[PDB]
Amino acid sequence: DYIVVKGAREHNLKNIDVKIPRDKFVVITGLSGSGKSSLAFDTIYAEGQRRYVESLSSYARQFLGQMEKPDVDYIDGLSPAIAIDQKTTSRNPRSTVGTVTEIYDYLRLLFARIGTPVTIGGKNIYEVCCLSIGEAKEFFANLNLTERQQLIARQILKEINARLGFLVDVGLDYLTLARAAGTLSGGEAQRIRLATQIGSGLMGVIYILDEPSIGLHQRDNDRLLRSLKKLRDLGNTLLVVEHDEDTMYASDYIIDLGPGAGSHGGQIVAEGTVEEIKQNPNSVTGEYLSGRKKIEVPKERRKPNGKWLEIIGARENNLKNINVRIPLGVFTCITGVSGSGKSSLINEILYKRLAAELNRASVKPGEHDLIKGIEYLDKVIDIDQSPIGRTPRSNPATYTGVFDFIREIFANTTEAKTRGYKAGRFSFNVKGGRCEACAGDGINKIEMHFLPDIYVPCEVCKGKRYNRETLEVRYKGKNIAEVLDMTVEEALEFFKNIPRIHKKIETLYDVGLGYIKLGQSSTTLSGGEAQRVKLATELSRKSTGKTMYILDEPTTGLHMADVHRLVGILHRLVEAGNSVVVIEHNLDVIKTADYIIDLGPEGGSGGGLVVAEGTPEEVAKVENSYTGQFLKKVL
Amino acid sequence: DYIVVKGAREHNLKNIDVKIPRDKFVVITGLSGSGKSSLAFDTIYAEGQRRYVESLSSYARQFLGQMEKPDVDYIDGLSPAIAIDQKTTSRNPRSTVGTVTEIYDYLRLLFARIGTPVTIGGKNIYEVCCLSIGEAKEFFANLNLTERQQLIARQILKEINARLGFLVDVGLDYLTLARAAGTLSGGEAQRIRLATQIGSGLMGVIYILDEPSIGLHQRDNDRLLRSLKKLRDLGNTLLVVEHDEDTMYASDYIIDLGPGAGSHGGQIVAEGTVEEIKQNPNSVTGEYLSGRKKIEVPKERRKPNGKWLEIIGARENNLKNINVRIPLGVFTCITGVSGSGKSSLINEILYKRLAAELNRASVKPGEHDLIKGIEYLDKVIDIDQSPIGRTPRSNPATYTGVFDFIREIFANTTEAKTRGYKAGRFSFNVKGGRCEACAGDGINKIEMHFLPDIYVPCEVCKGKRYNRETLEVRYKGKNIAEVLDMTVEEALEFFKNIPRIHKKIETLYDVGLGYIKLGQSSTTLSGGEAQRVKLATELSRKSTGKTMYILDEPTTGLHMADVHRLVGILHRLVEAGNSVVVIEHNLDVIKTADYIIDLGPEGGSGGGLVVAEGTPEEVAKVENSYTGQFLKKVL
DNA sequence: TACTGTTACGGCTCCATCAGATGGAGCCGTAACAGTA
DNA sequence: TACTGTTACGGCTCCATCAGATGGAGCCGTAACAGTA
Numbered sequence A, B: 001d002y003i004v005v006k007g008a009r010e011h012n013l014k015n016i017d018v019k020i021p022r023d024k025f026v027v028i029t030g031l032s033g034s035g036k037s038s039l040a041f042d043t044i045y046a047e048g049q050r051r052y053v054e055s056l057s058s059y060a061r062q063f064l065g066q067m068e069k070p071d072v073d074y075i076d077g078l079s080p081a082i083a084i085d086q087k088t089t090s091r092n093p094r095s096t097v098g099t100v101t102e103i104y105d106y107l108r109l110l111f112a113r114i115g116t117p118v119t120i121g122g123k124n125i126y127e128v129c130c131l132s133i134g135e136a137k138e139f140f141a142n143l144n145l146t147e148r149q150q151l152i153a154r155q156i157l158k159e160i161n162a163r164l165g166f167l168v169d170v171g172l173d174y175l176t177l178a179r180a181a182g183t184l185s186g187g188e189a190q191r192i193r194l195a196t197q198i199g200s201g202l203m204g205v206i207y208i209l210d211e212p213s214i215g216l217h218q219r220d221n222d223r224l225l226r227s228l229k230k231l232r233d234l235g236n237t238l239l240v241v242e243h244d245e246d247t248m249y250a251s252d253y254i255i256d257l258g259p260g261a262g263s264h265g266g267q268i269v270a271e272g273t274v275e276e277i278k279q280n281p282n283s284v285t286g287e288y289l290s291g292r293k294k295i296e297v298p299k300e301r302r303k304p305n306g307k308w309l310e311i312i313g314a315r316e317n318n319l320k321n322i323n324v325r326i327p328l329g330v331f332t333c334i335t336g337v338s339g340s341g342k343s344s345l346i347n348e349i350l351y352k353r354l355a356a357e358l359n360r361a362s363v364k365p366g367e368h369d370l371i372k373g374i375e376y377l378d379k380v381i382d383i384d385q386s387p388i389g390r391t392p393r394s395n396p397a398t399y400t401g402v403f404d405f406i407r408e409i410f411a412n413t414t415e416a417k418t419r420g421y422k423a424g425r426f427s428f429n430v431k432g433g434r435c436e437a438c439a440g441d442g443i444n445k446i447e448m449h450f451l452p453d454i455y456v457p458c459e460v461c462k463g464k465r466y467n468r469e470t471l472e473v474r475y476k477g478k479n480i481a482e483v484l485d486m487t488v489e490e491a492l493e494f495f496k497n498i499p500r501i502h503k504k505i506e507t508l509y510d511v512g513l514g515y516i517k518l519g520q521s522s523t524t525l526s527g528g529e530a531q532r533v534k535l536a537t538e539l540s541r542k543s544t545g546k547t548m549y550i551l552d553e554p555t556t557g558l559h560m561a562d563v564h565r566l567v568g569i570l571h572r573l574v575e576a577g578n579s580v581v582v583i584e585h586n587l588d589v590i591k592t593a594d595y596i597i598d599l600g601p602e603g604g605s606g607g608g609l610v611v612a613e614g615t616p617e618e619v620a621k622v623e624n625s626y627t628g629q630f631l632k633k634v635l
Numbered sequence C, D: 001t002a003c004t005g006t007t008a009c010g011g012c013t014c015c016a017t018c019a020g021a022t023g024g025a026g027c028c029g030t031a032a033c034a035g036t037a
């Protein structure tokens, strides 16, 4: 009736002991970097998978793969578990919806077993693969096959029906089975990934979902919550790590981590129901949910100064030749149901034309007639909706670009000048100044065949990634290993008189990563930490006073405090005289915008029109828009 | 704390509900054919494996394979399970001890990871593979490697040490790692199979062992029981299906099935401790253990009549050029520790020479000088230690040889003579008289890719395996489908006036298979049922009054009642004037023998000498023999 | 002449056993070119 | 002359993703040959 964990010390967990109720809807909350993933996916799921795998033969074990042994003492009440990872999965161009959701395999099995020589219900394999999800489901629900075929193909038909029912329930009935998985939107790809693993329900199985609401509108999130509630009612346990308020409100139990991030978190601050979390002063999530701490809606919203960006004849993808006016110099939020065509408009027309017109880029934009009002802009800065790549040869210092300046100033010292060194000597990714016994890695990763990998630190350089010859040159009493060793606050104090480094380090501090180390590997970063690193990298660039910031969903992996900090940064940028355009599903970011352009009313072929246009108060007066309904509810 | 099963109806289970204690030594007893395997390996293990597999992806599922869904309602308290099947596994000549026990893989991993360029402890891969188990274990326990190598290769060394420790504990220290697995004795192969799956212990794992004591002496069984007790004390649950008295006496809980076999069993008769089972009148196992029912030791043992079989210079395999005298006309039991060389003597010299001398066979015997006393014999009948092959095209009627006579008498009828039919028309394995829609199978087995197979009965012949044209000819009002449909008692009454069929059917009844059907598939037979079918096939042959019966472990898969029946049959054969020689580890069979030849004192290179020779009472006076010690204990 | 052993020969079925590679995409470091200030 | 965009190019690393085959052994059915009784 419980999953009891004792002595969990993985990553930054501070020897925490927790009890998780079984056959319930449990939600794990906390700040970005608290340790929710290290507790759910890296301890419980890892222990369950290892326990299941250890009972199999070596031949099967070397195919399935063994996870790393978690640093835990005793876990009880486990069971078979299915986990959905937080990180998004890229797709090859060949993979389609049917291939990804494992529907084509069942289709081939059915056609091979009860096929009529290649005719089940009066259709062939291509005629049934090239249909929308809703009509394919209604076709498969009206299959008049014989009794022998019914007995033979019971399981295949049941699996197909369950998968199609889930895909219809989430709201993806407009897609077909032949649509390429690599061209779907963020929310559609997230829902397809969810349906791949959770479409066919089981019994007595723990489901661990790490942020299952990427690029999902509130309406889509409600349908996903209904499906999750049905799956839990099927006799299962659900462990969902989320930052969404609706997910917490729709859960039986809440486990709150914190109280901070990195080395200041890894603990348990509060637990109980939603009201219990709200009443706990030590819980930051409860403080933000109870209204004690909140993002303040402006009393007066900025008005356009007469300069507008007019997009005429926008017909890219599913856009139905619409005209959109984006005011300049204010904060504008682009809203719509997942798949309605907000990314395909903004990121594929506005940014792709602004870059060519201003930054002298060579990227072909989408299908549009013309854009007017470009002359009121100087440069464009964009943040994509795609995640960042993770390599052990990467860290926040290299990603943001300050490591180049640090290496240059290290190579400009007196001793380095005497020895004839350059900036390439002070990097652990170039031969000449790095330890060759570890190739600048610092630690050695030994990979076994079927056993979990073992990490052993290097002994020649003691994990410093550099040899003594390169470590013999120091700047202000510190060598480059100590430079990579200090955190962002220490580096901010260290380089306070160097504007070039100080600007980017101050940006990193302002996005909320002062605790992080300059040399922490990208592979060991968190989702929110990587998102904020990308945000700081893009926002650390120089602003000319009349510049456009285009952000495509910068809320992913961010707690309420993090989005509050980002909102403050964006509002300061707006007050500086720049124009900020944000494609956002987060309603807290939306409620502070001075202008809203809403698209819909549906996704795919059912959307692409400007349902609403104006200030949030005016949009809330429109009953057609779901965004308007939610805005009216929360205003 | 329990494994609760409800509504189990697999095979012949009569909707039984049981509760199995956890972290205990549980033994399941009952008659041959009661349903112990169908309850342990076909319900609990099947459900656990299916539940674990269903949580994985299709790619891994179609590699691991899905077991058939058991006919059960609700099973709780499950966990990862490791099962050892009752049926023995044949081995290719290429496989060795290290390959089978998964020790070579760990050896290669260690040599690749901490090798010194190919030198770990001062030895190479061949110099360490070509050693006995004890010296290899003592070498690996004295490895003076460096600290970095110690940290790197901790798990590999731990696994190797645990496997070698188990192999030494069971008593196989005289074997090597390069020894071919296909040339081992029955007990040695059984112990190697056990060590493959149970050598490295785990925690919180259910172990299901189906008859883990094939070809094991009492001394070897004691060591195996000690190892099993240690493994259970490591925090595990053990479910052992056994007929051995020592295994029941060394278990915390006993679950008894019955009260019979086939359609007369499948229930639960009693449960509790050993004393509780003994005190239950409805429990046949308790009745045999408590002494109410027993095999009666003869008051006076038959003496040799002056005719002996002298084997001079027996040096085959591990035999040390020994001389053995086997009295003729009495019951002689060959006893010894597993590997001492009883099979290599008897089956490889005595039978292989008697067959050539009497049955005009062309099989080359082993290494011996000569055998004297052959002229007092007319024919030899042998039962091998190997199990029988299982095919769906097989049944007891075809195996024993009565189906040929039945087909001949069916083809000799008036209507068959008029139509010009032959015996080949009345068989479901020859084209012409069988249904071609199922190829004489009766049912169709549809195999999926990763889903469990589905069985659908044929519709053209309704599962009768024959068409209407072949079913239109009947003998005594019954067609051949009804002939295959009746049980052995019905066929015994049916063919009471036909001596040829009646002899074999009476033999089948006498071995205890009167309930079984003539047409039951061999693949669906039980281990004890197959053993008794082979015994009846070999014992149904004509006896000339002076003939030698050689039986190599005919007790496998047989309860105490079955071995009592077999002992009675063998004693009747002896009283008929024939000579019976039985290689037996069962002490109840041994105590009734009129002569005993004991070999030992150890296995492999440590045995091959006649430790004792004489009547069981005289052998019990020798302290050298473990067999003598047990005989003294039980006499 | 029939019962009882052996052998071969064709067809059918069960079981052991082995121990990832290739294409796609992102990131670091370096160089080159161009527009402003 | 310096700060800030773009592009290319080499090297390194992470991730998706596909959808068993072959040799060995036992058994049924049939035929042929031989030793007795």
Ligand SMILES: Nc1ncnc2c1ncn2[C@@H]1O[C@H](COP(=O)(O)OP(=O)(O)NP(=O)(O)O)[C@@H](O)[C@H]1O
Pocket: A011, A012, A031, A032, A033, A034, A035, A036, A037, A038, A039, A086, A261, A262, A263, A524, A525, A526, A527, A528, A529, A557, A558
């Ligand atoms: N190897 C490591 N050693 C120590 N700390 C680590 C290591 N890897 C990650 N961390 C830190 O451990 C903290 C928790 O990581 P993680 O559990 O992934 O965060 P999270 O709670 O899921 N955050 P988010 O996904 O953004 O909501 C973060 O501050 C990481 O930077």
Ligand SMILES: Nc1ncnc2c1ncn2[C@@H]1O[C@H](COP(=O)(O)OP(=O)(O)NP(=O)(O)O)[C@@H](O)[C@H]1O
Pocket: A183, A184, A185, A186, A187, A188, A215, A216, A317, A318, A336, A337, A338, A339, A340, A341, A342, A343, A344, A345, A603, A604, A605
């Ligand atoms: N390359 C493409 N070819 C065809 N259709 C596409 C392509 N890319 C996207 N679409 C479709 O265009 C519609 C709008 O997608 P897009 O504009 O990217 O989504 P969005 O509204 O921003 N929603 P989301 O990203 O989930 O928050 C969806 O139905 C997509 O499936």
Ligand SMILES: Nc1ncnc2c1ncn2[C@@H]1O[C@H](COP(=O)(O)OP(=O)(O)NP(=O)(O)O)[C@@H](O)[C@H]1O
Pocket: B011, B012, B031, B032, B033, B034, B035, B036, B037, B038, B039, B086, B261, B262, B263, B524, B525, B526, B527, B528, B529, B557, B558
């Ligand atoms: N498909 C089937 N349908 C009905 N009965 C079956 C089937 N398969 C096997 N049986 C019978 O079910 C009974 C129990 O089988 P099984 O569980 O294998 O026996 P067991 O208890 O392990 N006996 P043994 O191994 O000799 O000690 C036997 O009489 C089988 O002949």
Ligand SMILES: Nc1ncnc2c1ncn2[C@@H]1O[C@H](COP(=O)(O)OP(=O)(O)NP(=O)(O)O)[C@@H](O)[C@H]1O
Pocket: B183, B184, B185, B186, B187, B188, B215, B216, B317, B318, B336, B337, B338, B339, B340, B341, B342, B343, B344, B345, B603, B604, B605
């Ligand atoms: N072909 C072979 N070549 C070499 N050694 C062999 C061979 N067959 C058996 N041995 C060994 O000879 C010894 C005696 O084996 P064997 O006589 O078959 O055993 P047994 O005494 O009858 N015991 P068991 O069959 O387990 O009850 C063992 O050490 C075997 O490993």
Ligand SMILES: [Mg+2]
Pocket: A036, A037, A086, A526, A527, A528
């Ligand atoms: Mg996370």
Ligand SMILES: [Mg+2]
Pocket: B036, B037, B086, B526, B527, B528
């Ligand atoms: Mg059995």
Ligand SMILES: [Zn+2]
Pocket: A435, A436, A437, A438, A439, A440, A442, A458, A459, A460, A461, A462, A463, A465
């Ligand atoms: Zn090093």
Ligand SMILES: [Zn+2]
Pocket: B435, B436, B437, B438, B439, B440, B442, B458, B459, B460, B461, B462, B463, B465
């Ligand atoms: Zn048929």
